Ligand binder design. Sequence first.
Ligand SMILES: Nc1ncnc2c1ncn2[C@@H]1O[C@H](COP(=O)(O)OP(=O)(O)O)[C@@H](O)[C@H]1O
Ligand SMILES: Nc1ncnc2c1ncn2[C@@H]1O[C@H](COP(=O)(O)OP(=O)(O)O)[C@@H](O)[C@H]1O
Ligand code: BEF
Ligand code: BEF
Ligand SMILES: [Mg+2]
Lengths: 209, 518, 78, 43, 48
Amino acid sequence: VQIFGDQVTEERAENARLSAFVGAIAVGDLVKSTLGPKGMDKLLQSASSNTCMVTNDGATILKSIPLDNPAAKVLVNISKVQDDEVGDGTTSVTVLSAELLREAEKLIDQSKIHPQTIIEGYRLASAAALDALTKAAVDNSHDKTMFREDLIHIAKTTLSSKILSQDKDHFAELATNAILRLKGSTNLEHIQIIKILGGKLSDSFLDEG
Amino acid sequence: VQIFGDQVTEERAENARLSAFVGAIAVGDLVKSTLGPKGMDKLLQSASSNTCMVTNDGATILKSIPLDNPAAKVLVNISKVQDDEVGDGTTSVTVLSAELLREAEKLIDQSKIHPQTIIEGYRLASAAALDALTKAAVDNSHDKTMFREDLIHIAKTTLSSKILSQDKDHFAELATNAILRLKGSTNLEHIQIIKILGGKLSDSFLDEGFILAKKFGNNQPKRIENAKILIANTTLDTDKVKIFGTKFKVDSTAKLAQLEKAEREKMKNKIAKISKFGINTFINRQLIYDYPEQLFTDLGINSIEHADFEGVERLALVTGGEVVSTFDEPSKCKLGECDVIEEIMLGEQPFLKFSGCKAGEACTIVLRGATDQTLDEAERSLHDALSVLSQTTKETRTVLGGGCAEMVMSKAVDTEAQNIDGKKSLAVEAFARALRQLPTILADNAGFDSSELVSKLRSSIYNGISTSGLDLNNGTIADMRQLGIVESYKLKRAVVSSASEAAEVLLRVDNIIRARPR
Amino acid sequence: QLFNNSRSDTLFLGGEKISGDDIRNQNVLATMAVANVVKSSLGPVGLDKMLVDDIGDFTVTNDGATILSLLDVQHPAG
Amino acid sequence: PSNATFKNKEKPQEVRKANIIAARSVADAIRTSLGPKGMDKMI
Amino acid sequence: GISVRRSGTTNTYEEHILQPVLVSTSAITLASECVKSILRIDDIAFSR
Ligand SMILES: Nc1ncnc2c1ncn2[C@@H]1O[C@H](COP(=O)(O)OP(=O)(O)O)[C@@H](O)[C@H]1O
Ligand SMILES: Nc1ncnc2c1ncn2[C@@H]1O[C@H](COP(=O)(O)OP(=O)(O)O)[C@@H](O)[C@H]1O
Ligand code: BEF
Ligand code: BEF
Ligand SMILES: [Mg+2]
């Protein structure tokens, strides 16, 4: 006795777990090469427009490529969310997101443990991972001298994995100066990003005015 | 720049490994439920014929289902090999075959270790798992008393996972009696497996003698007592002719009548040549012509027609007779004798049951049951039993099953890893981990915490209680010697051997190339 | 007499099954079909029928069994 | 024992269930043809 | 048991309504045995 209408798909327990994992992993594994300093870039291309783009920003990959696996699209959005709430950590979110789910399938199959028990266990750990994080945190006080050098670093770190790795130092002061300049506003419309084709990359600048 | 023809597939390294793994693991993950006491059966059904089969025999599943993935078709064959070389261990081979490859992807990806180096480690483990197998082997010597109770166990262990689980003790004694009766002969043709529908499963039996799927020569006596038998291959209905081309050219009809009666005389004489043998029972592979059929009846000789190269060979072994032709000099050839050949009924069909024979060296087991599939399986289950027990007549050493056998190797392979060191070391431990993954599913199908139980049995065997095995009804660690869960060495020695080979073949693969289908 | 639906549990091949009332009535309807054709041909006041081969060729008869032989009958109960 | 041992794959549970149904249907086609008040079938 | 003629509760052995032991001995045994081989099934897969 068939229940649903036609063209309708039912992926239940045993098969719904597969999809959920196959999806997440397949997406996590796609951006894995983006991660870190000696990380690599993807070349995405549309069928539409005869357009393409060569990118690192892990969101920009995930946001772009088409997908069907709903579980995948979940992670894809968690990617945009991060790009919204912080701007960086796009690929760091997705990989850690998939690597949790990889590690679940290895528990759900090999061992045979309840998914809800895994949850009530992934939960205790998360609150403890975020715990030590604040204990190990290095908050930088009134010393704006000690904090600018501190900022320049964060950028230098962020930047190394893009084409801008080689001119890290250069682009780090162009960001640090621009943001300090911004005087504590957190809206980025205030920094107009005008790209004009030609010359070196080391030829890029923040104008005084 | 394209190289190949159209509809040609090239799966290279990165993707070839995917096929290799996904293909094997898929096949392994298909038969995993077959393994063990509290294991379950598959229902195979062909699109052709409207036929099906309800099976456990892992080979019968894999040999049946069609597949595309070459890496899968590899393990499919190694399953046939095991069924050819041992008869049992079809599923065990494939699962251990896959679990090794499962533990390879986990190394190739998660660890980044060269496949040739995993091969060069799997190799070091495989010769050490086969090592501690022989050391843990229990060979049974002259005490045929000790060896019979040993063989029965083998059957009891082999049978519990098939329908015959509930009737283990009964079928074990039916197999043990049949192989011991076979007098060492390692040919299974000698055991005729006649399946007739109806009644219970407890109702199956091995006949003391032989039952023949044939009839008597016509209006002949239904039950012969104090038999003496001639077994024959010579022609009867065909009318024996000198091969070449003997064409009659009769000048005038008159000589045709004589030459017609001549062929009758050639027969009458060829039956008289047999009459001189002094025998009340004549069995012949060939047909008995409507004429000779009577010539035996008038003389009182019972004549049975159509029991081929098969039937005749068994009769010669059970009656102690000879597969005779010529019949020119009766003194030199050896007759067959038995006590009574009375024609019984079994549900519907009329079988002639030879009872009380001269030498029991060929037998017939009659299987019974409620369903044509139940019978199918009983035969397939039984072949698995008449294989281990028949091959342990040749290879007389034993190893304790219930996961114990595979654990004792998991021990030695795991300590040799604490000896080898390097990046190979990891692949050596992995081999051990894969061997552990067998008792894991034995436990998973029954229902208890696979994690806890395997982890409980590891501790014991590793601690030196190298008898400890899985009690798969009580969910505990139990003594395998004292609970009689014994298996063939030749079985376990093949399983590890066969599987280790599968692994190296596939782990060497890095390019899958498919040509346009026919 | 709305065309009956094939059951959603039972699985039969190149074959349909009508049960109870639906068949009991079908039988009777197909039985009257065959009988009513030859009710006109009964009695001395009865009349004859003209049966075309389809190629024009034909036969005229009263003999009921010869009429019923000629009519192509499709139903079992017919 | 709140964590327990999780039953992983579900096809078993639903195949048994759907076999019985497929079978009970045949046994149901026959119920009309049992005993002296039982009715015959035309095939 | 049920007697069709009586339409109710009546002594069926005396009513001469009689069936062989084998017809019931085998009836239950086969059914119960078949169920055992139906419940063995945990998957169907289509073969070549
Ligand atoms: N120069 C560096 N040396 C060591 N680690 C670095 C360096 N630059 C970045 N990282 C690390 O690499 C990660 C940043 O990689 P990236 O591809 O930008 O991912 P995301 O987009 O998720 O931030 C961070 O985890 C950071 O700790
Ligand atoms: N009664 C039992 N108790 C515990 N383990 C058993 C029992 N019978 C068999 N086994 C184990 O289960 C395995 C047999 O499973 P089976 O499904 O027959 O696989 P295969 O087809 O490969 O022989 C053997 O390796 C043996 O160790
Ligand atoms: F690849 Be990222 F958003 F530093
Ligand atoms: F599945 Be087996 F050959 F006992
Ligand atoms: Mg980053």
